[PDB]
């Protein structure tokens, strides 16, 4: 045991010990706290009048928040204060994903339903690239080290670079109705994760494979039997599947009535089902805690979301129980319930009527 009491942890810190995960233990303690406290929602004043919000994403270190709206524009606010600072403007219809660049600075991409990728530069600067059949863009994901961008159009992946005006690679998916919907990467940029439509004769299903991208090898999606991880699942947007900050956990919404499950991504037990729970047919979003010990599930149809704490290691319906109940501080729905990157800063959820709020913990 690498100590468990804060009194003996601060004492060791004062005399320069640095043994074991003292900071990790302190963060786990501060996240175990903020559980018996109360939360208040502070609204955000947006310049124009957006009637809905779809997706949320954060800054590359920790200090900014992006937002999409049906009004065909993207708003960026500030977490510390709560005021918009930029108003992008320029799309023709509603966007679908943002995918803040993780590495360099203030670089934000953007999709649309007409086949446009902008790659904004915040303080001036914007590019453009168009499709060939006016098809929608499901998602994009950057690369941490290399200079590469992936676009989830209809069933191709283009592997574009924002240096020239055209991509340099095309990968097919055999048949035509097996589209691609998620191309999110891993935190260290060593693996890929795709989600394509499972062919059938009912509701559509998806399959999430785990391809390898260590040596910049183009994945072969034409084979539907290699490196399967989850098989059946249900995907709506980029907010329907999340990977923990450490990358050692992955959530899903496999059906059959929908049940929730999280699969470990460690190399020695890659595929184990571990924790599980049964929900109703109204769960839209799922997010994980920064330290990977709390899961929040957004609900839509009052109640806003539910938070659970993973307790039992390897099975049983008793795993994770209700500990939280967030409420709207008053026909309203929720489309995002993402956690803030800081370990124990608060919540942030969108509103079907076009409202962005930030919740923070307060005591009695």
């Amino acid at each position: 045991v690498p100590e468990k009491n804060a009194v003996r942890i601060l004492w060791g810190r004062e005399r320069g010990a640095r043994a074991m995960g003292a900071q990790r233990l302190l963060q786990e303690l501060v996240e175990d706290k903020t559980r018996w406290m109360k939360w208040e929602g502070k609204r955000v004043e947006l310049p124009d009048s957006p009637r809905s919000t779809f997706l949320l994403a954060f800054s590359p270190d920790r200090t900014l928040l992006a937002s999409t709206h049906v009004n065909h524009n993207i708003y960026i606010t500030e977490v510390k204060t709560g005021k918009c600072v930029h108003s992008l403007i320029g799309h023709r219809r509603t966007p679908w994903c943002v995918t803040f660049h993780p590495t360099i600075s203030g670089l934000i991409a953007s999709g649309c339903l007409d086949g446009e990728v902008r790659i904004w530069d915040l303080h001036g600067g914007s590019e453009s690239w168009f499709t060939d059949s006016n098809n929608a863009i499901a998602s994009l994901a950057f690369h941490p080290t290399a200079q590469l961008l992936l676009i989830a159009t209809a069933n191709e992946i283009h592997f574009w670079d924002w240096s020239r005006r055209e991509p340099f690679a095309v990968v097919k998916t055999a048949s035509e109705m097996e589209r691609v919907r998620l191309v999110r990467f891993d935190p260290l940029g060593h693996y890929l994760l795709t989600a394509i439509v499972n062919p059938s004769n009912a509701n559509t299903t998806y399959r999430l494979q785990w391809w390898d991208f260590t040596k910049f090898d183009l994945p072969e999606i034409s084979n539907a039997s290699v490196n399967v991880l989850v098989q059946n699942c249900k995907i709506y947007n980029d907010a329907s599947c999340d990977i923990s900050a450490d990358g050692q956990l992955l959530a899903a919404f496999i059906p059959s009535e929908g049940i929730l499950a999280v699969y470990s991504l460690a190399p020695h037990n890659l595929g184990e089902m571990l924790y599980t729970k049964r929900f109703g047919p109204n769960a839209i979003s799922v997010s994980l805690s920064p330290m990977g010990r709390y899961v929040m599930v957004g609900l839509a149809s009052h109640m806003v979301a539910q938070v659970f704490r993973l307790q039992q290691a390897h099975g049983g319906e008793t795993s994770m129980r209700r500990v939280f109940n967030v409420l709207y501080p008053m026909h309203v729905s929720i489309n995002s319930a993402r956690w803030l990157p800081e370990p124990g800063l608060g919540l942030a959820y969108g509103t079907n009527k076009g409202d962005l709020v930030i919740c923070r913990p307060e005591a009695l």
Partner: peptide, 11 residues
Amino acid sequence: CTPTDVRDVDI
């Protein structure tokens, strides 16, 4: 007219 809910927009 694009629907305001995520569960009834086609893509």
